[model samples]
Target: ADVYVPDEWEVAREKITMSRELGQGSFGMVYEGVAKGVVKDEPETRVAIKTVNEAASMRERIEFLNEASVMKEFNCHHVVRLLGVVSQGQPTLVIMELMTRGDLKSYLRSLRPEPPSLSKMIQMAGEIADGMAYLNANKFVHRDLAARNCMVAEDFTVKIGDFGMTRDIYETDYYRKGGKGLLPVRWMSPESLKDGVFTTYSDVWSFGVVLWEIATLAEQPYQGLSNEQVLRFVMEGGLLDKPDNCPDMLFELMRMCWQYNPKMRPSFLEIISSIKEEMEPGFREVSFYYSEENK
Candidate 1:
């Protein structure tokens, strides 16, 4: 019949055994769970189970399922893969491949005392750009593209998607309700703040903020600015200043992402290549090689 999921990705609810609580969304909690026989080869798969709160209305369930629909369209190294969904149940459950390291924001914040080397930071950024590039190519706009929405693997591989439904997990960065559900003013483009406009370009705009997050080791964007101030600041073209160690080229990309005209913003592929140009071979980045070059 007509359903959001096909048999390929439909999971049997009984086969899913929920475990640890990962984090709670306003609707419910994302838990660490296990799915049996979802993957033919992998008999038992560790999964992230998103359960809707028992009290959630039908409307909230639809929005929660939004994450599943958008994520299922993707299959890429930099995207968190969707394994299955229990759509036949009263409150549909969205199951996903587990990323052990958790969301990127907390991971970066944990490393605040000593941020990753520039090479490593940009490496993470490139992975995001790459994931986003694929998402855009797949014709899905990631309306919410902040660092908190990205998940990190045990090896620090960055994967994008998770559609901000669980954004309540973060107590910072979001500054305004601004009509039409929390607008995340700090990461929104001028037009997005002024008007309800969102496109890949706006996604690019949010990615720029993510870049600033990485460069600044997860410092709050527009720190000290309030909801009203942040809204006005972006509407007037104000931007987060370049982080202390942010390379000029990288900062330039941030500026490009915030171009007043959304059409002027670089596409995700363009953003990916720009980051690529700034990266050099690992051998050349060795401290000993740099020391010899300075001789």
Candidate 2:
């Protein structure tokens, strides 16, 4: 609930003492840095600094700024918070909250689908919907919503990250290509794929994909389906089926969210209510008759 403008004097004093590679992105790399005088009063603070390659062309700079702006504007516990931006000559540095557990993709590689429990998955889905609903109500579209963009905190809280591909719903109209649109094809909705238009309904479609990803521990959705194949299937009334071991009710909920006709999709509020109703605390068993169902 506090807003402070980044100080130019503080920016000049901050120095990257040790560079430990955090991760690599398409544009550049992120590092954990010990910045001195990052804040006027606080001389030493650990920060995650994302850097774009100095040799990047003009186009890259524009793209980086666009992404940075989105990150800068985003403020939520479910989304990674940007501390500030500092220009270091050629390569601009973006300071953000450091997430120790890393992204959802990498985290999934370490887990077996069986152990985390269906209850945990439901809890995660509820949290995700809560965060997404906030964004939707604010009229912001997370253009690239995917498992890879989600981060888990030490407390098991989920936070969406990487705003490089995020766009305002209104602004995206001018950015369409051949009516095919410009978004991650794998996570796109049917309408977005067919007509290059994105809406809140399309966002629900993406949420469905994320739900599938969560249930399957980040397995590739439609693993064998090619880009064109996936597009055809989506445009031709195809829907993502529930994963193996998925509970019927939860799977049905995800299916409903992924409906080709966006109008049929449920709002975030509906999703929140549905999950809370079915997955409330202490609701453990996967079925009404758990003993008989699994046996």
Candidate 3:
């Protein structure tokens, strides 16, 4: 059974063939790629490969390499899996599982006027919560969490992705000012914006926005509120209102994530349980009654 001894996590450079670009970060570009001998039994495996940009500087190279190292430590179905890396010579490639439907935000928007059912949305939310719970339990923070950061597979399964973003691939949800660099101000928590603190709780706040995106079918977080306006509203105690067709129980959970106090925000485990409970049929009577009375 020994063709040759394995090189630990090293993937053969010649085995990979890159396709068109999928997206780009500040220092790396991801491409749809095919790699031979990476998958067991199936010699040809389709993947997303993050390769160092030709013009990447020393700082960018080190920063871009951080994603590969952090990603390699995680193992979960609800989280995108890092298959391996192609680190031979100068091209340092981070190979990951292929998500055919692209990011969660884009997939949700494509549904358009017809959105998925409440239970389905909750299930998707649960998947993300579960993945996040794994990260949280390990004392690792996602740092950046959003619908745009999660990927949708062929079966509509959502998996958390992208460790960092020095560039905006979507370019629609971020803004820049006064050398602050581009940021997703709409998804940020008050504490993160007030200073430069990022914690699991900050991720919790962003999760609320992702849930809002699910509820609103990929609608922008604050319709007319500008970035600074969002900062003022967040810092001054304003919360995102319930979106259309959003169940009272679900909206209540979203509010829990948006609590001004980071300590008050629900952990990923707690959020997962709340979301999972909503999928139960026997809880329908209680939920329906409350849904009606939520007016």
Candidate 4:
């Protein structure tokens, strides 16, 4: 399917055929669409259309571009791919790779206790880590790394999505636009949630929550707690559980990722290596080996 890259950003102006709502949030509605006769240099072409509402404020418009720029800046197999952006109107639309399986949140909700096996989870964790490592190496922080922000292909190849909250370290001052602060409070690290400062460490902290979500088959983060309650609970030394099937090493790795001190957080390289090492001796190694061969 070819991705839709409209010359103009207005949904009313485009001739694209809307399919269905892929997802929606404060940003706007994301739709699956076909831009009749749209073509790319690549042979395989299909576009994911994100239609931004005209009523959104200027800050919201800039945020979409900031996100698009971040996605376009990186080329990683595990990260969501941005084909291009159309900003000819009030709410600019971003065209990106479409993952048919949708976000992790929906996928998890559909699964019974029969969650994806531990091997499958580790494989996804590895891919997600690879994507994050790429971002970390590039000095960008994905402020919102959660299950809902991740998309898993039918084959279980995971893609990290949504750069709306991404921030480049070198361009740190630029992130202060509109004085917005901190990571998603539910997924944020103690330090970040308190001080509204984000760094590589803070990003890692959110990654831990994401990992937990994957392992738990998508239990809503902080399920029933209000923001204030969640904050207090986390501050009181609460920790997530390791599913019965989760390997000890993998669970420990998650624990390390959420360490209170940002300095204590492990690097993405360390995370990748740790997951690889833990998966090597188990069924995960053999499973991936065969899966790759089948591919």
TM-score of candidate 4 relative to the true fold: 0.73
For candidate 3, report its TM-score: 0.82
Residues 176-280, model 3: lDDT tens digits: 743577778888888888886789999999999999999888898889988778878988879998997788877988899999999999988778666666554
Candidate 1 local lDDT, 1-295, one digit each (tens): 1234455677778899988998765568789989998777988999888888887665666666665776667767678888887777676788888888888888888986657887787778778887787777767888888888898987677888577754777756565565747667778888888877788888998998998888887888888888789888888878889888678877888888878788998987777666665444542342121223223
Q: Estimate each model's TM-score.
A: 0.83, 0.78, 0.82, 0.73
lDDT of 2: 0.67
Model 2: residues >4 Å from true position, as ranges?
A: 1-19, 34-45, 88-90, 113-115, 163-182, 277-295
- Native-referenced Cα lDDT, model 1: 0.77
The candidate with the higher TM-score, 2 or 3, is 3
Model 1 residue runs over 4 Å out of place are 1-8, 57-59, 90-92, 175-180, 277-295
Per model, state how many residue pairs clash.
0, 0, 0, 7
- Whole-model lDDT values for every prediction: 0.77, 0.67, 0.76, 0.66
List the candidate 3 regions with Cα displacement exceeding 4 Å. Answer: 1-8, 19-29, 39-42, 57-62, 176-181, 277-295
Q: For model 3, what is the C-alpha lDDT against the true structure? A: 0.76
- The total of clashing pairs for model 4 equals 7
* Cα lDDT of model 4 by residue, 59-135, tens digit: 76766666566566766667877765666564466667777787776787788655777777777777787777777
